[PDB]
Amino acid sequence: ITGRPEWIWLALGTALMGLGTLYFLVKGMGVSDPDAKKFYAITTLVPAIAFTMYLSMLLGYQNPIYWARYASWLFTTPLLLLDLALLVDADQGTILALVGADGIMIGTGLVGALTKVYSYRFVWWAISTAAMLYILYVLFFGFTSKAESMRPEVASTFKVLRNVTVVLWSAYPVVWLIGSEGAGIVPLNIETLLFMVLDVSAKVGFGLILLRSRAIFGE
C-alpha cells in the first residue's frame, strides 16, 4: 500500500503542509505588529487546513478520497484571496465579488467531477474556468493598480505573489481537463502528483514569499 505512487504523493503532501504550517507558526512567534499578525494568522491557517485534508485522505486510503482535497480548495482559495485583498487594502465590494466567483469556480468544478455524462464535464469546466478567469483578471489588472499607488515594498511583494497566483491557479483547470475528470489522458497517480505540487506551491510557497516580506508590516 505505501508503495503505491498515489499514497506516496499523499504522504509527501501531508508532510510538506505540516512542515510549512509549523514553520509559519514559529516565524510568527514574537512578531508584535498588528497588521503582520493578521497575515500570519490567515497564511498559517491555509496550510493547516490542507494538512488536515491530506492527512484524512491518507487515513481514508470516482474515489471519494479526493473530495477531501476539493474541500480544502473550497476553504483555502477564499483565504488566499483575502490575504491578497488585505495586502492591497481592497474594498469590501471587490472582495465579495471575488469570493462569490470563487464559490462558483469551486462549486461547478465539483459538479463537473460528479456528472455521469461525458460531454457535460467540459460544460461545468468551462463555467468554472470562466469564474477563475474573472478572479485572475481582478488580481492582475485591478489589484495591481491599487498596489502601485502604495508603499514600494507592498507593490513589489504583491506583483510577485500575483504572478505566482496567476500561474499556479491557471494550472488546475489544465490538469483537470487532461486528468481523469476530464479527458483521461494523464494517469491518476500522475494527476495526484500535479495537484499536490500545485497545492504546496500555492499555499506553502505563496506563504513563504509573503511572510518573508516587510510588506506585511504597518510601517
CB atoms within 10 A of CB 186: 16
Distance separating alpha carbons of residues 144 and 141, to the nearest angstrom: 5
Resolution rounded to one decimal, in angstroms:
2.3
Kindly give, in sequence order, each residue whose CB lies less than 8 Å from that of residue 153, ignoring residues fewer than 6 positions away.
Answer: 213, 214, 215, 219
Experimental method for this entry?
A: X-ray
Q: Which residue has the cell 511583494?
A: 157
DSSP 180: T
Distance separating alpha carbons of residues 198 and 54, to the nearest angstrom: 13
Q: Tell me if 47 sits within 8 A of 208, measured CB to CB.
A: no
Q: Which domains does the chain have, with CATH numbers?
A: 1-219 (1.20.1070.10)
DSSP 215: G
Distance separating alpha carbons of residues 64 and 55, to the nearest angstrom: 14
Half-sphere exposure of 106 (CA within 13 A, CB side): 18
C-alpha cell at 60: 481514508
DSSP 213: S
Kindly give, in sequence order, each residue whose CB lies less than 8 Å from that of residue 42, ignoring residues fewer than 6 positions away.
Answer: 79, 82, 83, 86
Distance separating alpha carbons of residues 123 and 1, to the nearest angstrom: 36
C-alpha cell at 122: 467540459
Q: In the chain, which residue ranges form alpha helices assigned H by DSSP?
A: 5-28, 34-60, 67-87, 92-114, 120-137, 143-148, 152-178, 188-200, 206-211
The sign of the dihedral angle between the CA atoms of 75, 51, 25, 212 is: negative
Q: Tell me if 180 sits within 8 A of 112, measured CB to CB.
A: no
Chain gaps in the chain, named by the residue before each (C–N > 2.5 Å): 61
Kindly give, in sequence order, each residue whose CB lies less than 8 Å from that of residue 1, ignoring residues fewer than 6 positions away.
Answer: 7, 61
Q: Which residue has the cell 491530506?
A: 54
Kindly give, in sequence order, each residue whose CB lies less than 8 Å from that of residue 93, ignoring residues fewer than 6 positions away.
Answer: none
